[PDB]
Amino acid sequence: AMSMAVESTGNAKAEAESRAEAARIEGEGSVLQAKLKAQALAIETEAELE
Amino acid sequence: AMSMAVESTGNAKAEAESRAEAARIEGEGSVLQAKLKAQALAIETEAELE
């Protein structure tokens, strides 16, 4: 029982930390997409402003 | 369990940091597109202004 218990806990922490680390860096990805697509829209309509 | 755990966490951080770094620089891409397509529209209708 405890054998396949640690089996199951690791086996699911597997498909867990997978999507988890993917989430980490897809998130910091959108973080800099934010900082950037900011300066995109921020000055598109700064020239179009004028 | 912990073996395929670190497997899964890296395997998903893979498809994560992929879209993440793509997001980084597609974002800074639109950032300068912004600074530029600004000066595009900013003076199209500066001559058309006149």
Instruction: Check if the beta carbon of residue A26 is closer than 8 Å to that of residue B14.
Output: no
- Name the closest residue on chain A to residue B16, using Cα atoms: A22
Q: How far is A35 from chain B (nearest CA, A)?
A: 7
**Inter-chain residue contact B41 with A26, CB threshold 8 Å:** no
Identify how the structure was determined. Answer: cryo-EM
Residue A8 has which token pair? Answer: 């199951």
Nearest one of A19, A46, A30, A12 to B13, comparing CA atoms? A19
Contacts of B23 (CB under 8 A, 6+ apart): A26, A29, A30, A32, A33
- The rounded distance, in Å, linking the Cα atoms of B8 and A16 is 7
What is the Cα–Cα distance from B50 to B47, expressed in whole angstroms? 5
CA B30 distance to own-chain centroid:
7
Output Rg (C-alpha) for chain A, integer angstroms. Answer: 21
Rounded distance, CA B4 to CA B1, Å? 6
Q: Do B14 and A22 touch (CB under 8 A)?
A: yes
Task: Determine the residue type at A31.
Answer: V
Q: What is the rounded distance in angstroms from the CA atom of residue B5 to the CA atom of residue A21?
A: 11
**Contact: A17, B9; criterion CB under 8 Å:** yes
